[PDB]
Swiss-Prot record:
The chain holds residues 326 to 609 of 624 of the full protein. Broadly expressed, with highest levels in skeletal muscle. Substrate-specific adapter of a BCR (BTB-CUL3-RBX1) E3 ubiquitin ligase complex that regulates the response to oxidative stress by targeting NFE2L2/NRF2 for ubiquitination. KEAP1 acts as a key sensor of oxidative and electrophilic stress: in normal conditions, the BCR(KEAP1) complex mediates ubiquitination and degradation of NFE2L2/NRF2, a transcription factor regulating expression of many cytoprotective genes. This is Kelch-like ECH-associated protein 1. Belongs to the KEAP1 family. It comes from the Eukaryota.
């Protein structure tokens, strides 16, 4: 399985789709997105890569995207799907039982607290219960068939709070807040724990990383990354966390760090073909 990185931003929204093979250390250049996208989120359902939301910030215009596009690795083709009810720039995405949940995001200056769910076998979006907080740049993690939305930006303050969505009950419940305010951080699930890495606390870009244990209801710092990163791509591949690119306050990073939970260590493993931030990343 490969680590796919779709879109991104560097002076403008990008159309790149590249894939990393963690065993051979090789990079693949695949079919470009039809529309350049930054601030999107990626996910995989049924071996198909999906690109949700974001926007195309160009030197000629700026349009937030309600689009859903699905890349087929066997055909190397992007195909458009049913758009969402609203444009969702800086979106969070999670997958439960084959359904793509789209969390928060912004449309111009409107910061969403609404959530919609996509059925791939019917090409249809449907609104579910809205979150208790408006969140853009929110991280999303699926654990125990529950959906966790972590941090983000509510329109006035960057958030350290987090809430949990219960699909069978269609309700949100606030959980323990993190130790650090994080917007545009990398949120993933590794070994029954929710990891949150990097982000932006309103003043600086962070290198700190904390993980949440569902049963202790406590956030715990772990070893920090070698680079400060915000708006980074994150995913899990064979028991290790990979973070890609991001913004460090000066440069757009091309570094790719790898976190091993057994030794609690971050190690640079590769570099992308160019620096970028706000990418959509998924594994298939
Ligand atoms: C500049 C200070 N700075 N440094 N870090 C910042 C972050 C994370 C944000 C948030 C918004 C906010 O928290 O109000 C935010 C969250 C998600 C996305 C973007 C921005 C825009 N994203 C970009 O590609 C991008 C481009 C350039 C720089 C950073 C990110 C992708 C998606 C804003 C401001 C921040």
């Amino acid at each position: 399985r490969l680590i796919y990185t779709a879109g991104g931003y560097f002076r403008q929204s990008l159309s790149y789709l590249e894939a990393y093979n963690p065993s051979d250390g090789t990079w693949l250049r695949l079919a470009d997105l039809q529309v350049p996208r930054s601030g999107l989120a990626g996910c995989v359902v049924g071996g198909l890569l999906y690109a949700v939301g974001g926007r195309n910030n160009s030197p000629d215009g700026n349009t937030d995207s309600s689009a859903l596009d699905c890349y087929n690795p066997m055909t190397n083709q992007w195909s458009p799907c049913a758009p969402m009810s609203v444009p969702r720039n800086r979106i969070g995405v999670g997958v439960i039982d084959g359904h793509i949940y789209a969390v928060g995001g912004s449309h111009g200056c409107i910061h969403h607290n609404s959530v919609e769910r996509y059925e791939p076998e019917r090409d249809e979006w449907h609104l579910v219960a809205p979150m208790l907080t408006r969140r853009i740049g929110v991280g999303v993690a699926v654990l125990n068939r529950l959906l966790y939305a972590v941090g983000g930006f509510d329109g006035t303050n960057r958030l350290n709070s987090a809430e949990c969505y219960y699909p069978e009950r269609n309700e949100w419940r606030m959980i323990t807040a993190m130790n650090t305010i994080r917007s545009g951080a990398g949120v993933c699930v590794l070994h029954n724990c929710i990891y949150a890495a990097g982000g932006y606390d309103g003043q600086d870009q962070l290198n700190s990383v904390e993980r949440y244990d569902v049963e202790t209801e406590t956030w715990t710092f772990v070893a920090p990354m070698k680079h400060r990163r915000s708006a980074l791509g994150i995913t899990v591949h064979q028991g290790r966390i990979y973070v890609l690119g991001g913004y460090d306050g000066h440069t757009f990073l091309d570094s790719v760090e790898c976190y091993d939970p057994d030794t609690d260590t971050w190690s640079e493993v590769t570099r992308m073909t160019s620096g970028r931030s706000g990418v959509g990343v998924a594994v298939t």
